[PDB]
RNA sequence: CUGGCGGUGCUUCAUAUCCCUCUAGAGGAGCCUGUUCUGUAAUCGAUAAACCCCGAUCAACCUCACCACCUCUUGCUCAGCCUAUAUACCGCCAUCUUCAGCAAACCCUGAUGAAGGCUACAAAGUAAGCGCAAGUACCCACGUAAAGACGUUAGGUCAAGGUGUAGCCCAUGAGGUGGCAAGAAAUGGGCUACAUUUUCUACCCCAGAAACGAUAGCCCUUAUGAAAUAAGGGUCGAAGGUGGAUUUAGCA
């Protein structure tokens, strides 16, 4: 429990573009709160939509060997959350993130977080 | 330990040709051009043909992964549908699953 | 079965609608209604012979 | 018989110091029963002893609610506070509005590299950086998709390498050669055309 | 007659357990989910290597203990791991549940150089659901 | 008997211990906190009703198993032990006499209700001579304190939703009203615009009526909204579009124009739109290729053979 | 190879076509010979690191078998079943 | 007595179904696609619902485990076994399945025979268990999705893994170039077009005329490469003649 504040530059995120793909939505949904419920606690707002899936259906054959007539429905699904963040230090950036993988669900809710450095100039 | 030998058959092959690229980019790129009359053209030509058999991705046969099974196989999973559908049925795929709509 | 048991077709009917029956109309507004087509669009100009010797003469669905 | 704080678990106990580690269910030490299992026509879901639906969870017992609120309030530290930036990006676009993207996707299992999340750009506003105000004649039209009609949003992208940092100084060294080979222009800088002016210049 | 998971009746009498007792479309309405990885997205990479390793551990725990699963594992990711989840059947003593858990987990670690730790659920009776 | 019992207890232990040890430490906690708990704590990654983790009262789940009606000594309690379906018997007896002495004077609920109230089975005979024998104490003209028990089991009937309102006007900008309202009809797109009072045309984002819709029937559908309420040329338009294609579109854009109409219009007159049904969408979408057949719809050729 | 690889009571049930385990093998006692703190010596009270000869493997093994065939013998065990009049049958048996 | 079967009697249903009505295509020629197989040094398994635009979602070689030529005993696997066995299975799938029953444990009846057990103004039937049912997903619970139970077809598969018996032990195995991708003989299906809205043009629904189809070659072999099947670029810009029962699904 120590700030380990030293001196040297860090960087700032400009408008943190947050995603979360995920297949079903009870998943979606416990990762979407525990999500809000730790911006809350850092004290950041966030904004959601109602997307649709993603049908990438690839069918095939039902019997392994021969046999043709009937073909099989396989298909994944995946609904976007869009949490994106506004303004923190690299630091808490990366607590955060590191306290968000030390539980992420394993295969569903899947992250897509995409930061935006700046980069001081000459 | 392969099952069959087409195994070891398309594991050499890939092999061989995963070995070199650099050399089959640049003549392939040499081929198709007007630039520089055909004398360099067919040299390049005449040298990609002097590289052995097998060394060649040509030779590749996108099979399955149990017993060599080209039979609906899937690229992106590699092995055939044998134990994938048995996972699909059961659930240990997240997601990949019947489409239920 | 690609229609749907519980959607059901509206009622074009609104020219005798200008002056039991309040019945009725409260039975129709209690229905399930749908959207009507446009090839056969009740219009003023649905001529029932016309209209009929259309869709015979309906090609690939060019109405 | 009778396992480890389990059932006889005193009531009312510190709910966070019950899952302070990621574990699965453990149905052996929940004192919770709950009703897990698809009930029969004239059944019961099956009980808690022994039930593969809890398992199959992905499990967030750990890190409840409050549990999540203490461990928030205990790692406030070991960060760096942010000075009034002050929200909405507007202040930041005013002094600095270069802004490089970067994304970083997530995977399970042995490996953990990822580098198909390396698109990076090269947005860096020239008219705000101030060194070659000459170039505005020039960059306005050498670069390509750019020149907006309503926003204008200035960006030199150059993602012929995949690294940010010598991304960044890829870009200050071109900065500079542009700086150079720009004040000695070339030929056809004044004299453009007579069919093509994205600024007016003589003749016409 | 299809019968890929779904099991044929016969008679009233079929100590089936609970998650053997499910057919294998109800995987978004009552069966959930055993092993995860993000190689069955729209779209991730790192899919036939974790089905492989997990089809792989799955025999693998199944053997070491012959005969001492009330049913099916429940693999699991969470780290550089695989955490499996199973309904142990109170069989051996704990003394060499204890060593064998350990020899197996050593022997993971040393071998794919990845610690796969597992868990534990000791139930005496196989969790019955349905007489089909 | 007892198993009800174990399991109430095993519920009010697990009750106690979820206000306790949790957070929410009141124990009068409805099913609201229990809903959030499984949602959040206890992702199912399911959608089943039942499947779904419910722990609640074991008496509104489990089909209770009715204790024994006797205790020692045997001598079941009740005296119409024999006829099957004590309950049951009991009832029509008590009907029989109820009409018997009011001829000497001179919705119903479902199954799966009764059966969750009590615990006795029933067949289809049984349930059609019980409503017979309701019906004929209803029309056999009798008292009141019989007929009002008789009638307590018809509960509700539920009727909801049948006319419709007035749609967001908006009162802003200026003092004529502007509605905006949408339109969809096989996966097409098309808001309207359509302004209040106001002699002059109907425009299309700078395009009028007249410049859209080349076809006569394209036309005549819409102005149907117009033809109906007779204001031929009284409000302008901005409608836009956003997919679909020609008779989707038009069909869109009919149902968004009469929507913004009736935002502003008579009752009387929306209520006799919603009936033409012109006000709403008809799900029919293009045919979908069978993955076990050939072509869209046709299946396999010389499958038979 | 490891794909020719499944579970065991498929293939009984294949071998043995009705239609139309590893007692022998110990799980405890390692199959190669060697000897450790755990079992086959004093339960951790002389606890520590040594290795059997393979022979003694290989005559642990043969062991094993012969206990194989012996419950085999056991298996083959008769029994006394009464006849009942007719040889064989259940006439008047009890 | 149970069942099968009847050009077997009576009664009720079929709502694209079995007919009384209607649609585009096969019963006219060329390319691709298969099969039994004559060429052969060239797997060919099913060969009437249960098999072929199935490895084919592609036969330059990779597909090909077949021989012309060389190989080996540790046989990359404590092998290969595609050498027979799938009419010996696990496992997988297909019609009936356009269905509604299928049964453990009991009771009654047939002078106690194989067997049957239905009459709600009620004559012996009670029925846990599975399924229809029911329940659940995207856009709801609809439309689209999952299931279509016991069982005939000894339905097909050693051809994804092992598999009841036999054997190659110095191969009956696979590995290095070559090949089978034209039809002795029979033929379904995908495209080209069988003509007047076919082929050509403008108004983004303001009209007519001759009364149209590189179908394949040759090189760069595309897509690659040791080596090239419909080809992106130079030669077919024409020629065929809606066909008689029958046939496929279709209530918007
Ligand atoms: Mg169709
Ligand atoms: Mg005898
Ligand atoms: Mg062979
Ligand atoms: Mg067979
Ligand atoms: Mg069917
Ligand atoms: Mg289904
Ligand atoms: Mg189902
Ligand atoms: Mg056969």
């Known amino acids: 429990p120590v700030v380990t504040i030293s001196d040297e530059p860090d960087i700032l995120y400009k408008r943190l573009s947050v995603l979360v793909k995920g297949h079903d939505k009870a998943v979606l949904d416990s990762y979407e709160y525990f999500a809000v419920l730790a911006a809350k606690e850092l004290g950041i707002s966030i904004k959601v939509h109602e997307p649709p899936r993603k049908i990438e259906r690839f069918t095939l054959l039902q019997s392994v060997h021969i046999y043709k007539k009937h073909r099989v429905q396989y298909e994944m699904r995946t609904l976007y959350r869009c949490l994106e963040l506004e303004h923190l230090t690299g630091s808490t950036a990366d607590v955060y993130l590191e306290y968000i993988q030390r539980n992420l669900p394993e295969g569903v809710a899947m992250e897509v977080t995409k930061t935006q450095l700046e980069q001081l100039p000459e | 330990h392969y099952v069959d030998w087409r195994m070891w058959r398309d594991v050499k092959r890939r092999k061989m040709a995963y070995e070199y690229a650099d050399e089959r980019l640049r003549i392939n790129s040499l081929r198709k051009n007007t630039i520089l009359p055909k004398i360099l053209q067919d040299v390049a030509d005449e040298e990609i043909a002097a590289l052995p058999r097998d060394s060649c991705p040509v030779r590749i046969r996108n099979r399955c992964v149990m017993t060599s099974r080209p039979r609906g196989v899937k690229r992106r999973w590699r092995l055939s549908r044998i134990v994938f559908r048995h996972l699909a049925d059961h659930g240990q795929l997240s997601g990949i699953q019947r489409a239920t709509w | 079965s690609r229609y749907s048991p519980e959607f059901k077709d509206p009622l074009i009917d609104k020219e005798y609608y200008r002056k039991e029956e309040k019945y009725v109309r409260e039975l129709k507004k209690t229905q399930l209604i749908k959207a009507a087509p446009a090839g056969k669009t009740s219009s003023v100009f649905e001529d029932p012979v016309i209209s009929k010797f259309t869709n015979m003469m309906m090609i690939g669905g060019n109405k | 018989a009778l396992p480890p704080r389990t059932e006889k678990m005193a009531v009312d106990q510190d709910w966070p110091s019950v899952y302070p580690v990621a574990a699965p269910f453990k149905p052996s030490a929940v004192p919770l029963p709950v009703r897990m299992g698809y009930p029969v026509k004239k059944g019961v879901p099956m009980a808690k002893e022994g039930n593969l639906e809890l398992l199959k969870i992905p499990n967030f017992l750990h890190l409840t609610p409050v549990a999540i609120k203490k461990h928030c309030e205990a790692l406030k530290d070991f960060c760096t506070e942010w000075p009034a930036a002050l929200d909405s990006d507007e202040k930041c676009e005013k002094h600095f509005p270069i802004e490089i993207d970067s994304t970083d996707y997530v995977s399970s299992g042995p490996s953990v590299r990822n580098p198909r999340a390396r698109v990076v750009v090269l947005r860096v506003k020239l008219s705000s950086l101030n060194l070659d105000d000459h170039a505005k004649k020039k960059l306005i039209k050498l670069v390509g998709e750019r020149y907006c009609k309503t926003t204008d949003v200035l960006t030199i992208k150059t993602d012929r390498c995949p690294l940010r940092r010598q991304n960044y100084d890829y870009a200050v060294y071109l900065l500079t050669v542009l700086y150079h080979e720009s004040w000695n222009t070339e030929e056809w800088e004044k004299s453009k055309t007579e069919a093509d002016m994205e600024e007016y210049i003589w003749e016409n | 007659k299809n019968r890929a998971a779904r099991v044929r009746v016969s008679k009233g009498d079929k100590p089936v357990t609970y998650e053997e007792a499910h057919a294998p479309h109800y995987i978004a309405h009552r069966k959930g989910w055993l092993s995860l990885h993000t190689g069955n997205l729209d779209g991730e990479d790192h899919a036939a290597e974790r089905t492989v390793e997990d089809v792989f551990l799955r025999k693998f725990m199944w053997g070491t203990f012959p005969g001492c699963l009330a049913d099916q594992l429940v693999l699991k990711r969470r780290g550089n791991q695989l955490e499996i989840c199973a309904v142990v059947l109170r069989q051996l003593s704990p003394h060499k549940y204890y060593f064998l858990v350990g020899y197996s987990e050593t022997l993971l670690s040393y071998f794919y150089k990845c610690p796969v730790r597992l868990h534990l659920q000791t139930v005496p009776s196989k969790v019955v659901y349905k007489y089909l | ?253 009919r149902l968004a124009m009469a929507k913004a109409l009736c935002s502003f219009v008579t009752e009387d007159e929306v209520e006799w739109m919603r009936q033409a049904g012109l006000l709403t969408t008809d799900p029919r979408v293009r045919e979908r290729k069978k993955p076990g057949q050939e072509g869209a719809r046709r299946k396999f050729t010389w499958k038979k053979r | 190879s490891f794909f020719t690889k499944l579970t065991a009571d498929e293939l009984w049930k294949g071998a043995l076509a009705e239609t139309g385990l590893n007692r022998g093998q110990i799980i405890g006692e390692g199959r190669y010979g060697f000897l450790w703190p755990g079992l086959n010596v004093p339960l951790m009270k002389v606890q520590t690191i040594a290795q059997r000869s393979k022979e003694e493997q290989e005559k642990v093994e043969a062991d094993m078998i012969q206990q194989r065939e012996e419950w085999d013998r056991k298996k083959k065990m008769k029994v006394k079943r009464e006849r009942g009049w007719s040889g064989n049958s259940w006439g008047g048996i009890s």
């Open chain 6, 1 to 253: 008997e007892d198993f009800i019992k174990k399991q109430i207890e095993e519920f009010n232990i697990g009750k106690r211990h979820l206000a306790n040890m949790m957070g929410e430490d009141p124990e009068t906690f409805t099913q609201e906190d229990i809903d959030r708990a499984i949602a959040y704590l206890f992702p199912s990654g399911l959608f089943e009703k039942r499947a779904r983790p419910v722990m609640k009262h074991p008496e509104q789940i489990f089909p209770r198993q009715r204790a024994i009606q006797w205790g020692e000594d045997g001598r079941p309690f009740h005296y119409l032990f024999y006829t099957g379906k004590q309950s049951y018997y009991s009832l029509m007896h008590d009907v029989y006499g109820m009409l018997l002495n009011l001829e000497k004077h001179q919705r119903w609920l479902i199954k799966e209700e009764l059966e969750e109230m009590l615990v006795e089975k029933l067949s289809d005979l049984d349930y059609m001579q019980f409503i017979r024998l309701l019906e004929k104490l209803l029309t056999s003209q009798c008292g009141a304190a019989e007929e009002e028990f008789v009638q307590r089991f018809r509960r509700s009937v539920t009727l909801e939703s049948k006319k419709q309102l007035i749609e967001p006007v908006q009162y802003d900008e200026q003092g004529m009203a502007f509605s905006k309202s949408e339109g969809k009809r096989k996966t097409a797109k098309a808001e309207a615009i359509v302004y209040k009072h106001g002699s002059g045309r109907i425009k299309v984002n700078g395009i009028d009526y007249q410049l859209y819709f080349p076809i006569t029937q394209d036309r005549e559908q819409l102005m149907f909204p117009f033809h109906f309420v007779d204001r031929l040329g009284k409000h302008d338009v901005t409608c836009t579009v956003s997919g679909g294609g020609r008779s989707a579109q038009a069909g869109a854009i």
